[PDB]
Design a protein around this nucleic acid. Structure first.
Ligand SMILES: Nc1nc2c(ncn2[C@H]2C[C@H](O)[C@@H](COP(=O)(O)NP(=O)(O)OP(=O)(O)O)O2)c(=O)[nH]1
Ligand SMILES: [Mn+2]
Ligand SMILES: [Mn+2]
Length: 430
DNA sequence: ATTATGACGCT
DNA sequence: AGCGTCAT
């Protein structure tokens, strides 16, 4: 009872940009704004592959991973923006630079954990304590939460979406105990006020809209963020978890959408996250390992301890290109030319990284996939990265992979290569 | 012939 | 170190 820690110590937010690459292109090209729009890479094969979709286009069924030609069958007026091509490959520099814009704004409010090109976690615990001090016990006005949903409300004792949002927010605020500076629900509410301010700053200073989740840990904050996109934020309280998880398919939790989540479902004969509560910690550890078992035992109760890491920058910088079907690399000249193309992009990104961030990569990882292998990587080899020079890096990558070529002929490459991947790792302060 | 990444756990 | 998983 009283000693049963409830994982309510922290206030954690997850901010995720809405249809991010689409918004970057819509900012640049006003003709694309407020339209069914998608971003594609390449064009020749089936119109290119869609990687981002505006909410207007999603209403027609357009999704990521869809070929543009098929998307056009669902949405004939779909507008398309193509990712830049440089050195024969997709070049995502524009979106990385836009990401840096957003991360630098978020960092004004708290130390952030960059989790992807378009999202970051925020530990707002200390900022919340400060704002609570400033409030001096003053209640929180609904006017300070103009885009916030409270998950699970309204309940009990109404036709429009905004009206439902305001009803739930009123029920939440009316039940708040604001004389207690240690009430977790109050702390979450102040966190949501701060996140409204952060999201307002992002939109004012970049033009980009985003959604967010506010809860007591990273997994619940990420889930919350998804609940009401686009352009809204959602508060998931500790008390909302039993109802939320009672119908939540296990795969919707981050980390359980693959083989492990399938094994939870099959071994235990359950469907929903809430059903996990009936098992002991030891039972879950016996099926899924000590670490996964403890994580599942806590997570189905709304509890997770993974910290928001103080990391605004990516840990690795990588360049990769697939060579599908008849485009697979089958000569030594081809392999060297594309290694050089990847290495040149890598050199340019690394040199800019060193200038901006006062650090140097020290290890080069070379990954390839060979024809007939379904795995992502057929082989990974590391070597030393001592100079930011594309010719040296491509020569070294060739040296570490060249023993892959089973062809006796010096010129041919067999079996052909369907992917090259260069990734710079192990950064040191320079 | 989804693609280009990036994080992280395991042994 | 190299591989596998999850993600998207
Ligand atoms: N190259 C590449 N980029 C991708 C891929 N998948 C996503 N991206 C890029 C394009 C995406 O814009 C961006 C962010 O990914 P999300 O947050 O998962 N999706 P979004 O922000 O579009 O919509 P929502 O409002 O639902 O969050 O990452 C991929 O497979 N390949
Ligand atoms: Mn997003
Ligand atoms: Mn995202």
């Amino acid at each position: 009872g009283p000693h049963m820690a409830t994982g309510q110590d922290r206030v954690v937010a997850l901010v995720d940009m809405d249809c991010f690459f689409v918004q970057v292109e819509q900012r640049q090209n006003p003709h694309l704004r407020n339209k069914p729009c998608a971003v594609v890479q390449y064009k020749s094969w089936k119109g290119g592959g869609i990687i981002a979709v505006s909410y207007e286009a999603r209403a027609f069924g357009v999704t990521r991973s869809m070929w543009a030609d098929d998307a056009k069958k669902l949405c004939p007026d779909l507008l398309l923006a193509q990712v830049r091509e440089s050195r024969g490959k997709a070049n995502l520099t524009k979106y990385r630079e836009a990401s840096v814009e957003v991360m630098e704004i978020m960092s004004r409010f708290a130390v952030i954990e960059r989790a992807s090109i378009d999202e970051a976690y925020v530990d707002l615990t200390s900022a919340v304590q400060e704002r609570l001090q400033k409030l001096q016990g003053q209640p929180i006005s609904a006017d300070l939460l103009p885009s916030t949903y409270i998950e699970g409300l309204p309940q009990g004792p109404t036709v429009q979406k905004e009206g439902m949002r305001k009803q739930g927010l009123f029920q939440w605020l009316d039940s708040l105990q604001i004389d207690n500076l240690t009430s977790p629900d109050l702390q979450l509410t102040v966190g949501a006020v701060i996140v409204e301010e952060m999201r307002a700053a992002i939109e004012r200073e970049t033009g980009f809209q985003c959604s967010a989740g506010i809860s007591h840990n990273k997994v619940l904050a990420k889930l919350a963020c998804g609940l009401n996109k686009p352009n809204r934020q959602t508060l998931v309280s500790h008390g909302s978890v039993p109802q939320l998880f009672s119908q939540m398919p296990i795969r919707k939790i981050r980390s359980l959408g693959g083989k492990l989540g399938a094994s939870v479902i099959e071994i235990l004969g359950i469907e929903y996250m809430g059903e996990l509560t009936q098992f002991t910690e030891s039972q879950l550890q016996s099926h899924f390992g000590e670490k996964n078992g403890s994580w599942l035992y806590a997570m189905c109760r709304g509890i997770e301890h993974d910290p928001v890491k103080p990391r605004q920058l990516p840990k690795t910088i990588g360049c990769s290109k697939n060579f599908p079907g008849k485009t697979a690399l089958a000569t030594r000249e081809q392999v060297q030319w594309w290694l050089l193309q990847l290495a040149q992009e890598l050199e340019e990104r690394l040199t800019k990284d060193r200038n901006d961030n006062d650090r140097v990569a020290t290890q080069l990882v070379v990954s390839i996939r060979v024809q007939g292998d379904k795995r992502l990587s057929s082989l990974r080899r590391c070597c030393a990265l001592t100079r930011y020079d594309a010719h040296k890096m491509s020569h070294d990558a060739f040296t570490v992979i060249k023993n892959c070529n089973t062809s006796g002929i010096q010129t041919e490459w067999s079996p052909p290569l369907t992917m090259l991947f260069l990734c710079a790792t192990k950064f040191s302060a320079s």
